[PDB]
């Protein structure tokens, strides 16, 4: 049984449903190729600076990550079209509404481009959370998903390039003695395609066999504003922020987050006052 | 059973150990009483400004706490005591790291100055962080506090005045039929001292029987880093922030925080590096 695939514009309501099933959906045409476009071209340098992961300059080393793998984080002050146009994508927060109700507000965890290099080997079969997060590990096993993971497809997503390997239903296994790359399916995507996974889903980036080929992906860990967030947003100049929406700001932890208790006293106040009163904080302003 | 009564100093190591099987733990001479004194004046003002909890001006309204409570949080800016001697006392700190080693870094919650009017009312018996954090009520029973609450006396506690009820081993209770008020017994300190208690503790404010006297507390949220704390310190002057210790600034959350995975890579991070390198923060500059 291959994931389901379906529209992001006329099966929206079907998304989570189905992701809470499966543990795993295709999302076709997620982005429009003119956002890919547009976010290729404004990352495109980023991606090539960025030193090796386990750089030694770096404070705050990934040791996890491979050495022919490039991440970039704290997009809003890289990429217009990430900040605008992703950052207020009305399926992302269908979806995430959702999927976190029963908690309350939810924020971006990490919004990261990740570049695969030729012949990168496949990632070993994991779920994502496991070097921020150790509390997830200490969840009731029947606890409602507090994080959710976008792959987005900036580039083709083929069997030979090494496309997303997912074990359908692994969401749900207590048990771990089945995993295995015998257990996985392929997410086979176009630019703008979206492979939606939970923090539970059982998953590896695919080995680059063409040793020719460049994968490039958009990683999007919405999380419950409960949890605190991979990246920090705090150094992005403030005319930027005030250049967003005020969702926009909310979910890179530029206002104070709400939980679903019925007499909610909120997350990230200031005396009974919100972050975004107390500092005069504007919205949509232009550069 | 009393609650057990511990010496800051002499009996430090035996405190957290205390508190995980008993599930509360008196600190005597917590903070010494000049701090008390200094914390005293330097809040004493800003108790009867501040609002009814629910006030109408205030965007995040506190709809749980009585109307004869007054609540004052994000100290730092307030209190010279609070942001130099609390946030750096040895005690504090060799209990949390006692308590969160599991999962990793810790900061403040909420510090927040609580004082009570006279006549005000026993609050209902609760556990904390229902109010803030639902994900808590997913954790596993048996899963180890993700946050603690120091409730330090800023005035005399006794029975009369309203000091606060514990039932003893509530921590560990997942059948809640055994509570009532008849399984408490009292917090009877002195100022400076305090008690410690779990997120799952059961606890309650007294009444206040005398008519005459008022009750003041500091309470102390000390939760691992990868919760969202109740109060943010985005607005706190940066000439105030630079003018802390590094492990204040942390604890206030103007710093990158580390979980206790083996391979962490970090959290509030900016392309591997963190906050205060970033921002060149600068640590104890005099104002
Ligand atoms: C080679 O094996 C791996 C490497 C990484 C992970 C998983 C993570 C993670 O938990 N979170 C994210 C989320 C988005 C993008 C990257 C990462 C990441 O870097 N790590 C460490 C697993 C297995
Ligand atoms: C009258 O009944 C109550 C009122 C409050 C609580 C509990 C909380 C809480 O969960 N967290 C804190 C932590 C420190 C100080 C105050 C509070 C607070 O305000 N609330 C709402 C319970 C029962
Ligand atoms: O490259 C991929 O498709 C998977 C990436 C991933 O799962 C990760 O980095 O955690
Ligand atoms: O006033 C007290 O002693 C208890 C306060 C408290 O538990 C609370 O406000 O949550
Ligand atoms: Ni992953
Ligand atoms: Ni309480």
Same mark, same amino acid.
């Given at each position: 049984?291959?994931?389901?695939?379906? $529209?992001?514009?006329?099966?929206?309501?079907? +998304?989570?449903?189905?992701?809470?099933?499966?543990?795993?959906?295709?999302?076709?045409?997620?982005? !429009?190729?003119?956002?890919?476009?547009?976010? =290729?071209?404004?990352?495109?340098?980023?991606?090539? #600076?960025?030193? +090796?992961?386990?750089?030694?300059?770096?404070?705050?080393?990934?040791?996890?990550?491979?050495?022919?793998?490039?991440?970039?984080?704290?997009?809003?002050? +890289?990429?217009?079209?990430?900040?605008?146009?992703?950052?207020? !994508?009305?399926?992302?927060?269908?979806?995430?509404?959702?999927?976190?109700?029963?908690?309350?507000?939810?924020?971006?965890?990490?919004?990261?481009?990740?570049?695969?290099?030729?012949? =990168?080997?496949?990632?070993?079969?994991?779920?994502?959370?496991?070097?921020?997060?150790?509390?997830?590990?200490?969840?009731?096993?029947?606890?409602?998903?507090?994080?959710? =993971?976008?792959?987005?497809?900036?580039?083709?997503?083929? &069997?030979?390039?090494?496309?997303?390997?997912?074990?359908?239903?692994?969401?749900?296994?207590?048990?771990?003695?089945?995993?295995?790359?015998?257990?996985?399916? @392929?997410?086979?995507?176009?630019?703008?395609?979206?492979?939606?996974?939970?923090?539970?889903?059982?998953?590896?980036?695919? &080995?680059?066999?063409?040793?020719?080929?460049?994968? @490039?992906?958009?990683?999007?860990?919405?999380? +419950?504003?409960?949890?605190?967030?991979?990246?920090?947003?705090? &150094?992005?100049?403030?005319?930027?922020?005030? $250049?967003?929406?005020?969702?926009?700001? @909310?979910?890179?932890?530029?206002? $104070?987050? @709400?939980?679903? &208790?019925?007499?909610?006293?909120?997350?990230?106040?200031?005396?009974?006052?919100? #972050?975004?009163?107390?500092?005069?904080?504007?919205?949509?302003?232009?550069?």
């Amino acid at each position: 049984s291959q994931i389901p695939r379906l $529209s992001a514009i006329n099966d929206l309501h079907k +998304i989570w449903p189905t992701v809470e099933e499966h543990g795993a959906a295709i999302i076709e045409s997620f982005l !429009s190729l003119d956002i890919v476009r547009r976010l =290729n071209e404004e990352v495109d340098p980023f991606v090539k #600076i960025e030193p +090796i992961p386990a750089a030694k300059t770096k404070d705050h080393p990934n040791h996890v990550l491979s050495t022919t793998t490039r991440l970039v984080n704290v997009l809003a002050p +890289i990429s217009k079209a990430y900040r605008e146009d992703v950052l207020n !994508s009305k399926v992302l927060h269908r979806i995430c509404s959702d999927a976190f109700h029963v908690y309350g507000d939810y924020w971006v965890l990490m919004g990261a481009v990740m570049e695969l290099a030729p012949s =990168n080997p496949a990632q070993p079969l994991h779920r994502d959370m496991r070097f921020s997060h150790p509390i997830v590990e200490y969840l009731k096993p029947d606890a409602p998903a507090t994080s959710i =993971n976008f792959l987005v497809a900036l580039s083709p997503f083929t &069997a030979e390039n090494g496309a997303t390997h997912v074990i359908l239903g692994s969401h749900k296994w207590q048990n771990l003695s089945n995993v295995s790359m015998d257990a996985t399916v @392929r997410a086979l995507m176009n630019p703008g395609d979206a492979l939606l996974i939970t923090d539970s889903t059982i998953h590896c980036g695919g &080995a680059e066999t063409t040793g020719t080929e460049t994968r @490039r992906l958009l990683t999007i860990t919405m999380g +419950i504003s409960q949890l605190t967030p991979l990246e920090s947003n705090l &150094a992005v100049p403030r005319p930027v922020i005030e $250049s967003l929406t005020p969702l926009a700001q @909310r979910l890179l932890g530029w206002a $104070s987050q @709400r939980s679903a &208790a019925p007499r909610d006293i909120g997350l990230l106040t200031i005396r009974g006052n919100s #972050i975004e009163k107390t500092m005069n904080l504007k919205a949509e302003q232009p550069l």
